[PDB]
Amino acid sequence: KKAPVIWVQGQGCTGCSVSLLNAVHPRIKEILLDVISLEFHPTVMASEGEMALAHMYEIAEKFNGNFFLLVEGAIPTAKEGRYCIVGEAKAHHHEVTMMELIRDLAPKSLATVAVGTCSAYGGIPAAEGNVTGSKSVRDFFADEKIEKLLVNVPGCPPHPDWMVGTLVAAWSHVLNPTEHPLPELDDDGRPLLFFGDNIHENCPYLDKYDNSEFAETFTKPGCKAELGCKGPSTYADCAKRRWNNGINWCVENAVCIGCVEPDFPDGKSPFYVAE
Amino acid sequence: VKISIDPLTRVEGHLKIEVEVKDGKVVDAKCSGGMFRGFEQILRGRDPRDSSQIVQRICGVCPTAHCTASVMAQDDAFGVKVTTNGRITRNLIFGANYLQSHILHFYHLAALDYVKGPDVSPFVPRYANADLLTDRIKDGAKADATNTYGLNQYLKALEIRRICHEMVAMFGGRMPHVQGMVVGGATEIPTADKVAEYAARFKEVQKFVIEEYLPLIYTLGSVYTDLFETGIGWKNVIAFGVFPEDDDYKTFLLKPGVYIDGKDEEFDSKLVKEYVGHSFFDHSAPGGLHYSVGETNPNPDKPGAYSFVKAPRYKDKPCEVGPLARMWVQNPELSPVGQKLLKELYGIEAKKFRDLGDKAFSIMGRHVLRAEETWLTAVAVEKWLKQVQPGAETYVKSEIPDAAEGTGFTEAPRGALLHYLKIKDKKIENYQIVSATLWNANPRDDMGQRGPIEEALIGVPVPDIKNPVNVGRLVRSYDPXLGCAVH
Ligand code: SF4
Ligand code: SF4
Ligand code: SF4
Ligand code: FCO
Ligand SMILES: [Fe+2]
Ligand code: NI
Numbered sequence: 001k002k003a004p005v006i007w008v009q010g011q012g013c014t015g016c017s018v019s020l021l022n023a024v025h026p027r028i029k030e031i032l033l034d035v036i037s038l039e040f041h042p043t044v045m046a047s048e049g050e051m052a053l054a055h056m057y058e059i060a061e062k063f064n065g066n067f068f069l070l071v072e073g074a075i076p077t078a079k080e081g082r083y084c085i086v087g088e089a090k091a092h093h094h095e096v097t098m099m100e101l102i103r104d105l106a107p108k109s110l111a112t113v114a115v116g117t118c119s120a121y122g123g124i125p126a127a128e129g130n131v132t133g134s135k136s137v138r139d140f141f142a143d144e145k146i147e148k149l150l151v152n153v154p155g156c157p158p159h160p161d162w163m164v165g166t167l168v169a170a171w172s173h174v175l176n177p178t179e180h181p182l183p184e185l186d187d188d189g190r191p192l193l194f195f196g197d198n199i200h201e202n203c204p205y206l207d208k209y210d211n212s213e214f215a216e217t218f219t220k221p222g223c224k225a226e227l228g229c230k231g232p233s234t235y236a237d238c239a240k241r242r243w244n245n246g247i248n249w250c251v252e253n254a255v256c257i258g259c260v261e262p263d264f265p266d267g268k269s270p271f272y273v274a275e
Numbered sequence: 276v277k278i279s280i281d282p283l284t285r286v287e288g289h290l291k292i293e294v295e296v297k298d299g300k301v302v303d304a305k306c307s308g309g310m311f312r313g314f315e316q317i318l319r320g321r322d323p324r325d326s327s328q329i330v331q332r333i334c335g336v337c338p339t340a341h342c343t344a345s346v347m348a349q350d351d352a353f354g355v356k357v358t359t360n361g362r363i364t365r366n367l368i369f370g371a372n373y374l375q376s377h378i379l380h381f382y383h384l385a386a387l388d389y390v391k392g393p394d395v396s397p398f399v400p401r402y403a404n405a406d407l408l409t410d411r412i413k414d415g416a417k418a419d420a421t422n423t424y425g426l427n428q429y430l431k432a433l434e435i436r437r438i439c440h441e442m443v444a445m446f447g448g449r450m451p452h453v454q455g456m457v458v459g460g461a462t463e464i465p466t467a468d469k470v471a472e473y474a475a476r477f478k479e480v481q482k483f484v485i486e487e488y489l490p491l492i493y494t495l496g497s498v499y500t501d502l503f504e505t506g507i508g509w510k511n512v513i514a515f516g517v518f519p520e521d522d523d524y525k526t527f528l529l530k531p532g533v534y535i536d537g538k539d540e541e542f543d544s545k546l547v548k549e550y551v552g553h554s555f556f557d558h559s560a561p562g563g564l565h566y567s568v569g570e571t572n573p574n575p576d577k578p579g580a581y582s583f584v585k586a587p588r589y590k591d592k593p594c595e596v597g598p599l600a601r602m603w604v605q606n607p608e609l610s611p612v613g614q615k616l617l618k619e620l621y622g623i624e625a626k627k628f629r630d631l632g633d634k635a636f637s638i639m640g641r642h643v644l645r646a647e648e649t650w651l652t653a654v655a656v657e658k659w660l661k662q663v664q665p666g667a668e669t670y671v672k673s674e675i676p677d678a679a680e681g682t683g684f685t686e687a688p689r690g691a692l693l694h695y696l697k698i699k700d701k702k703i704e705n706y707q708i709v710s711a712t713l714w715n716a717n718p719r720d721d722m723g724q725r726g727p728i729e730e731a732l733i734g735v736p737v738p739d740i741k742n743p744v745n746v747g748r749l750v751r752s753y754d755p756x757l758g759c760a761v762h
């Protein structure tokens with residue numbers, strides 16, 4: 001049986017979705033045809049407008065309590081949620097704000113999975129200078145008094161293995177709970193499976209670091225600490241997993257910017273200034 | 276009769292399209308960008324160097340375009356002169372995503388309006404009278420063969436687009452959102468090994484473009500010839516120039532240029548202004564603002580406003596952007612595949628892009644331009660893989676100036692893109708973005724002129740109000756990115 005998924009986008013850049021399209025364990029064709037039943041996703045679905053929204057609401061009721069609500073992007077609460085209009089319901093008028101959609105759907109979901117640092121912690125849309133009242137899913141849940149299992153799979157964007165891995169583990173648990181456990185989460189609600197490791201501790205440049213050998217420039221040898229690397233205060237398994245099918249990763253190429261952390265970007269800024 | 280479509284799916288971001296139909300044709304249209312984040316506000320007070328990371332989050336589909344525009348704006352402000360290897364390396368990082376983006380768009384965003392997918396979500400539900408290849412081709416075997424040919428390509432393209440991201444990651448670190456482009460050049464010097472790896476991946480992608488993508492485009496157009504005659508619009512196009520071919524930025528793979536009211540002219544950035552008359556923003560002065568003095572004061576309550584997309588105008592004229600604009604402006608020679616198939620399938624003798632003449636300006640003309648541009652970009656990438664020099668310096672170290680201005684010009688896969696940066700006290704004082712879809716999906720300006728997409732919708736056939744397929748088809752031919760249009 002395939003895991004039903006309703007994927008909604010608020011204040012997102014579609015980067016989390018594109019990162020998922022790059023998956024290799026398994027590849028995207030297998031994910032869509034064998035693993036999940038992607039019922040609603042604005043970027044790739046065949047239907048549009050009223051037909052798309054009606055199908056989503058149809059699935060939310062028929063699969064009430066049995067679909068994963070995936071959230072990409074932050075939730076803006078200022079100006080009555082008007083900074084993010086996700087749709088227009090057929091029943092004469094009725095523009096639906098992201099606030100309304102999440103308030104409606106989240107209680108009917110099996111669990112809400114906030115993919116990306118935006119939905120999980122607020123991220124860039126919620127950074128200093130915004131005037132949209134941008135909120136993370138967890139902060140919105142608290143404000144709304146929503147009592148629902150919420151798994152945070154951060155990263156800007158999250159590596160596809162983290163997203164797919166978290167969802168497969170969660171679905172196996174739904175199918176046979178006494179035999180398949182839910183991913184163990186840290187205090188920020190993210191899977192220890194992928195976010196338990198410290199980048200710096202697992203970094204290949206660690207010996208250079210310990211011997212005070214720092215690259216004075218992006219193109220000079222040595223640890224990237226002086227270039228602004230935030231690996232010391234960042235927890236993700238990037239140093240072992242790497243990116244884009246093991247082709248390269250942020251630290252080898254430049255510096256880690258701490259994209260998976262709740263305080264990204266403000267707490268990791270300036271990006272090119274050493275921690 | 277009025278029809279509203281929100282969300283208009285298989286487009287990037289939040290888009291609402293509303294049309295009025297009369298006598299089986301669209302008689303009026305309004306385009307709305309429904310989601311705002313305010314990057315121009317968020318960037319204020321920050322270390323200018325952070326912008327190349329932050330602006331990438333405007334869009335996960337075209338982050339390299341924004342990164343490129345940003346690092347060039349910073350190079351300009353910081354007074355950095357990029358190295359030859361730095362310039363080539365940034366073209367290789369960015370070029371791999373041009374390929375990814377166009378392939379992603381045609382198959383995964385546009386193709387479902389013509390190709391019947393399997394009977395499982397998200398391929399269904401779909402309009403009951405969708406006018407797909409299976410509905411158009413009356414001979415059963417030919418209909419199945421063409422639909423299957425298209426669908427198998429859709430599926431293979433899922434893998435092809437992923438390989439282009441491995442290519443971006445080669446010198447970019449990862450994708451979406453690269454780490455490899457910063458003010459001063461590129462952070463990683465290409466090794467002979469890595470160049471060979473990019474090339475091997477590249478060969479696979481190029482082969483697909485030539486043997487599969489181009490053939491399907493031309494074949495599709497031969498079935499939908501009526502679509503080469505609607506979705507016209509203004510016929511004004513603009514391009515800023517992309518992929519500098521020399522260190523002084525005197526030459527580009529596709530030149531800056533403007534084509535308005537039937538005349539070709541050189542591009543002058545002083546004539547670019549943004550209007551907010553029907554946009555949710557307040558300007559301190561009427562008459563439009565040049566980007567160097569642009570303002571970002573959101574106002575969802577502004578009477579008469581209906582979108583978060585501002586309205587850019589060149590000499591007060593609406594101009595469309597994207598592959599069609601670049602190809603029309605540059606008028607390159609068509610691929611061998613296109614030249615042959617235009618003769619074999621349409622009886623058209625063409626050597627250059629403009630030989631499509633009259634309607635390169637249509638729903639299908641936009642898809643053709645994008646496919647041809649993909650092949651053109653691939654020809655160039657193969658050339659750059661030969662020019663790149665393993666071991667040669669890609670990075671120049673520069674310092675944040677106390678006060679300066681900088682402007683970065685380029686072309687995102689969806690169209691013309693510029694980033695204007697203004698520094699004060701070594702921090703971002705103002706940052707203005709005039710981005711791609713902004714030019715295509717804009718609302719009416721203060722003088723009342725419709726944006727390129729709203730204008731192109733006028734005249735589109737809607738013989739079936741319950742199944743208004745051509746409205747979405749016209750919109751998707753522009754490959755709109757609302758995340759970019761609004762930022
Ligand atoms: S987490 Fe980053 S990649 Fe994902 S939607 Fe937010 S800005 Fe885009
Ligand atoms: S490169 Fe970053 S994570 Fe690696 S040893 Fe140096 S500071 Fe630590
Ligand atoms: S190395 Fe750092 S910036 Fe790169 S993906 Fe991992 S946590 Fe994010
Ligand atoms: N391509 C792309 Fe994105 C848009 N529109 C930018 O700039
Ligand atoms: Fe802007
Ligand atoms: Ni984009």
Ligand SMILES: [S]
Nearest residue numbers: 337339340372
């Ligand atoms: S891009």
